[PDB]
Amino acid sequence: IVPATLPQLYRQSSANLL
Amino acid sequence: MDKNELVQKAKLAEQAERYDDMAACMKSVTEQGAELSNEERNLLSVAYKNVVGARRSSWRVVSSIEQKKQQMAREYREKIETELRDICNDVLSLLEKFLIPNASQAESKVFYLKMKGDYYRYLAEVAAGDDKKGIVDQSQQAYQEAFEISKKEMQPTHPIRLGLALNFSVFYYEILNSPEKACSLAKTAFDEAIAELDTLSEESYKDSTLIMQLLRDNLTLWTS
Amino acid sequence: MDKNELVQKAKLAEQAERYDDMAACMKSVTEQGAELSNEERNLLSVAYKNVVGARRSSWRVVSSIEQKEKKQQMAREYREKIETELRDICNDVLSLLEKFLIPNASQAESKVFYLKMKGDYYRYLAEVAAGDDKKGIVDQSQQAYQEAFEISKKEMQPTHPIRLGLALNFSVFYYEILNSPEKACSLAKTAFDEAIAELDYKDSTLIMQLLRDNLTLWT
């Protein structure tokens, strides 16, 4: 577990998903 | 030249979400000239799918903002388009120079010919009106050949056969603007696969079943 | 180039999640010498946050593999390559901050924000710092944080999000790099409590939960 710091981060369906 | 060191480094990259690096390793492995294993085959594909997919997603965003001084979006979209064409040409270069020619097993021939159909489909999505016909032709031609072979040599429940149907159907519906052909291709694949549903093992069922759920969703989506 | 066209293009890149493009746009704007507006400054920060953050995440992963024989040799080889990119990105930002962003800054709110960034980028260098230069790099991170901390105290109210974000980050510096949990816990508690009393903008609330999340994890 890493401590929190600031800043912080329709159609079609084809094979080989991401 | 320590291909295992590259197949290993490639596995390290995927873990670190550094697909550009992973692609560089797998492309070097392909360049040796030895036919890829089924494990290398799937690493080269995942690497390239993530690298080109980032470009496709970015292009769909910049080209959606273009629809609604937005000349800047058109310029950037041109940029992203060049990056995308460059990545497709790469994969297609590997496909013609090494993968397709060294493909001994039929399953790999279908997997490689399907990849060729997908990469030409991505080029078609961004093609100059002039070049578009030729590129569409190339994609359909690759998928048709993969199709014929999969029909001959694989069971309807094979995931490569099912994934080929899914992608070939999405090519007809979007690239060819043919809803009647696309729906028919997806329904047959689903129906033939469910006709032989009893064959799937407890361990390997999810591989074909997931693709089948997908054929159904496209069909549901296209019919409503 | 046109500084506003570059600023617009950076907004497009961010929407597209193309940060290296976003960073290239914002780096050019800063090089012009124009004082960054509270919008150009945020864009430059978000771009770089995401560039370096990708390296920081891959580093942790490739290290984790090292703690979890031929592969171990190759992982270190990869860990060093990612470290070199990370250092390079930090030094880029540190050059901008030191050389242009900090000197041009006139208002206190911007100066506190730039000095916090310098504390963060030195903190990232410290996480992968070579043992020899490790003491100098930590010294630099702390110094940047402390200088911003004092200025924050004398010019902002506790509720200001930049003052709050400064406390969060500076707290995490003490616990993670100085291994001084009482400071980090004590420093974090004071900002919350001061934030809780004035409590008179809802961006500060987001920060309070993060402070609460950390005192809690440390607890």
Residue numbers in the entry:
A (entry chain C): 520 to 528, 613 to 621
B (entry chain A): 1 to 68, 75 to 230
C (entry chain B): 1 to 68, 73 to 204, 211 to 229
Which lines from the publication concern this structure?
The glucocorticoid receptor (GR) is a ligand-dependent transcription factor that plays a central role in inflammation. The GR activity is also modulated via protein–protein interactions, including binding of 14-3-3 proteins induced by GR phosphorylation. 14-3-3 proteins form a family of eukaryotic regulatory proteins that act as dimers, principally heterodimers, which recognize and bind to specific pairs of phosphorylated serine/threonine residues, thus forming part of a regulatory system with kinases and phosphatases. The mechanistic details of the GR–14-3-3 interaction were further resolved by determining the crystal structures of 14-3-3ζ in complex with GR_pT524, GR_pS617, and GR_pT524-pS617.
Hence, a dimeric peptide, GR_pT524-pS617, consisting of the two 13-mers GR_pT524 and GR_pS617, identified above, linked by a pentaglycine moiety to permit flexibility, was synthesized and tested for binding to 14-3-3ζ. The dimeric peptide displayed a remarkable avidity effect, with a 1000-fold improvement of its binding affinity with 14-3-3ζ, compared with the individual monomers, and a Kd of 18 nM, one of the highest affinities reported for a 14-3-3 motif. One diphosphorylated GR peptide was bound to one 14-3-3ζ dimer. The electron density allowed the assignment of 18 of 31 amino acid residues. The pentaglycine moiety was not visible in the electron density because of its flexibility. A proline at position +2 relative to the phosphorylated serine/threonine residue, such as P526, is a common feature of 14-3-3-binding motifs 1 and 2, and this amino acid produces a sharp change in the chain direction. P526 of GR_pT524-pS617 adopts a cis-conformation. On one side, it allows the carbonyl oxygen of L525 at the position +1 to form a hydrogen bond with the amino groups of K120 and N173. On the other side, P526 induces the peptide exit from the binding groove and avoids a clash of the remaining portion of the peptide with S45 and K49. Co-crystallization of GR_pT524-pS617 with 14-3-3ζ led to the identification of two new binding pockets created at the interface of the GR peptide and 14-3-3 protein.
